[PDB]
Design a protein around this ligand. Sequence first.
Ligand SMILES: Cc1nnc(-c2ccc(OCCCOc3ccc(CCC(=O)O)c(F)c3)c(F)c2)s1
Length: 265
Amino acid sequence: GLNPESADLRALAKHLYDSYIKSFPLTKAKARAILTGKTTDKSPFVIYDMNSLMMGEDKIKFKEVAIRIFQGCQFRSVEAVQEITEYAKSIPGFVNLDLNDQVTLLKYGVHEIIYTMLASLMNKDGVLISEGQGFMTREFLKSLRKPFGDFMEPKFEFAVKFNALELDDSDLAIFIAVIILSGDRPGLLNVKPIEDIQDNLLQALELQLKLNHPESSQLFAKLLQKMTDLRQIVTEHVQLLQVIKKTETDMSLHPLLQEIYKDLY
Ligand SMILES: Cc1nnc(-c2ccc(OCCCOc3ccc(CCC(=O)O)c(F)c3)c(F)c2)s1
């Protein structure tokens, strides 16, 4: 904030953080407080096997077991899409873009955002579910029958490496906006207005990380590099769905996810 240009970058960071808080009900700071046993929040019920999953169904409240779980992740993605869409609308310039490009930017951005923010709810042993009321172990997720036995592993591998960056919600707010305003999504009609916005967002992210993580060298670059991992998670998940739909012909797909995945990659 030391000159007027950089003060406007601060104002943009604060705007996005504010909108993020308003849009996403379970923040990283709340997730971390649940996972680490802090006294601001309530310990989760832990599901690590079939009997504890049965108990959990009664305690949390919220068909083979693998399919119920897989579909539960899809319902969560649909809620996430709703929240990401409302956040996207708050990004200055987004709603003024061509409507076709608004739709394309959401279509290709929402999963990258979902896996970014999924890391906030993960550690190397498992993941928060039902808004933090439950915690499902990574080993229980690995135990599910084929073809569902490894669908969570790439997301855990990503999370453990992403979490070592030690980003907070104020950082994440800007990073998620940068993800959405990507000028290289396929089929965009007007790239230039997108990149002008993305430029501003990147400038704000960069100053946010230098202020908030003054001791953490090239954090900005190391964060942008993680956009590689996110892309690979997505393309791998799409391949897995192609497999699942051949053996599991009785599995339905929420219409929002169907539209998103159509001709995605
Ligand atoms: C009985 C039960 N019924 N539901 C249960 C349940 C268990 C675990 C859940 O979440 C674990 C973390 C979310 O992980 C993700 C999220 C999104 C995707 C991508 C999905 C797509 O968009 O295609 C993903 F692949 C994994 C959960 F929400 C519900 S237990």
